[model samples]
Target: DKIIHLTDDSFDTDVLKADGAILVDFWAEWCGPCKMIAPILDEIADEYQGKLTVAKLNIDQNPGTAPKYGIRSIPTLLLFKNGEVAATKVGALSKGQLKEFLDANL
Candidate 1:
């Protein structure tokens, strides 16, 4: 499945109120680290399609949501469950590291 595009207008309903586990990749088009992790995120999204909802929030387009979550850096990966933050990671991460992070949190 394709990653959900989240903006300031859709954040509340899409990420904040979504049921079950959700992974939100806070990124921007010009961010190199964000670009590096794109495929890894896509692979993970496809791997966990039904089990978890994977979405990407463009920091450039959705500035409000980023600050609300105290996201000071690009490529911040946040794990939310039951509409609450469960885990958070900053910077680029390897697939194995990301998997481990998700395994521990989700």
Candidate 2:
């Protein structure tokens, strides 16, 4: 599918060490803003296809990962490039905003 569901066990290998541009969303089930941006991320994932990967990491489920990224808020979007964080954004964003975010980096 479009999104990769990340867990504490898979977080390191799947995201931190992954290749290319991967957008990792740090969020929780109770996060309403996170839910709002969910479908937008999906469309981005689909459009980018092989060029980029849109991932989701539930902070509540994978507590260890979020802390390492200094994620104090839900819907924190971390864009990684070759295992390093290239960019980061907080809160829910519009599709255009997200596209600009990716285009500027990717």
Candidate 3:
């Protein structure tokens, strides 16, 4: 119900133009760090279900999207609000840190 699986085709409407706060994770299957951070995002998706929209984009599958956001690495978390990028995180984050980031922005 939460985490939205995003692609190059759906990126714009599902995220950029969406209402409220959104967290976009740019990642790939080969990234161990991305795998490590998955569960943390899952928890956040459920905990902040109504307040935030958690989106995931696989760079391996949607290569056309990352570079648009200057995402050079895996597990880049971009926080969006009202059709604009409000914040970005380039690596894995602890659950506490994730909450802090959301609390500050959302």
Candidate 4:
């Protein structure tokens, strides 16, 4: 599946009400680190299809959700399960590191 485009309108139903685990990438188009991690996230999303739902929320477009999550930085990856945040990492991450983070949380 393609990466879900998340926004203030869909945040509640998509991320918050997700049936299983969800990895939300809070990013913006102008963020260098966010761009660097994009491919890594895409790979993970493809590999973990069905097991996890991967979504991306553009901070500039969806300011409401970003601030609601207390996102103080770009590239904030949030792992959610059962409608609550399981883990959060602020910054870029390698594929291996991201996999480890997901393993620990889910």
The residue pairs found clashing in candidate 4 are none
Candidate 1 to truth, TM? 0.94
For candidate 4, the per-residue lDDT at 43 reads 92
lDDT of 3 at 16: 82
Give one digit per residue, the lDDT tens place, for model 4 in 1-106: 5799888999999988779999999999999999999999889989998899999999898788887778899999999999899899999889999999998987
Clashing pairs in 2: none
Pairs of residues clashing in candidate 3: none
lDDT of 1 by residue, 1-106 (tens): 5789888999889988888889999998999999999899889989988788889988878778888888888889999998889999999989998889888986
| Model 3 lDDT, full chain set | 0.90
How many Å off is the CA of 61 in candidate 4?
A: 1.0
The C-alpha lDDT values of all candidates are 0.89, 0.90, 0.90, 0.91
Report lDDT (Cα) of residue 47, candidate 1. Answer: 90
Clashing pairs in 1: none
Query: In candidate 4, how many Å is residue 27 off?
Result: 0.4
Error of 1 at 9 (Å): 0.7
Question: Each model's TM-score?
Answer: 0.94, 0.95, 0.96, 0.96
Error of 2 at 83 (Å): 1.0
